[PDB]
Amino acid sequence: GNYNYRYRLFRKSNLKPFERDISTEIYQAGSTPCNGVIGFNCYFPLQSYG
Amino acid sequence: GNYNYRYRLFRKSNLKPFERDISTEIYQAGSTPCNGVIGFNCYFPLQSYG
């Protein structure tokens, strides 16, 4: 596996044309404020191709 | 996507039978140390199924 290539899988809104998002903030997918820690319903925004 | 189910993708050694691993330390896959930060050759050990 080559896991050094990542893609943004979760975002609040769709991107504008020619816009990039290099921010690494934990995406809340529920109703729980989980303070930037991965776990239940808090996922990392970037996922590896592998 | 249901990303609440995760599996450990990276480990230094194989498991003994009936052994569990709940650690979340960053798997160093290169010469450079990771310092607990994801990036190039430093991966999170648990990956969601999707």
Give the technique used to solve this structure: cryo-EM
Q: Are B6 and B50 in contact (CB under 8 A)?
A: no
Whether residue B48 and residue A47 make contact (CB cut-off 8 A), yes or no, is yes
Q: Are A50 and A44 in contact (CB under 8 A)?
A: no
Whether residue B47 and residue A48 make contact (CB cut-off 8 A), yes or no, is yes
Q: For residue B27, what are its two tokens?
A: 């798997």
Report strand pairing: A46-48 vs A6-8.
antiparallel
Residue type at A13?
A: S
| Chain A: closest CA distance from residue B7 (Å) | 12
Residues 1-50 of B with CB under 8 A from A: 3-4, 9, 24, 29, 38, 40-41, 43-44, 47-48, 50
Give B21's Cβ-side CA count (13 Å radius): 17
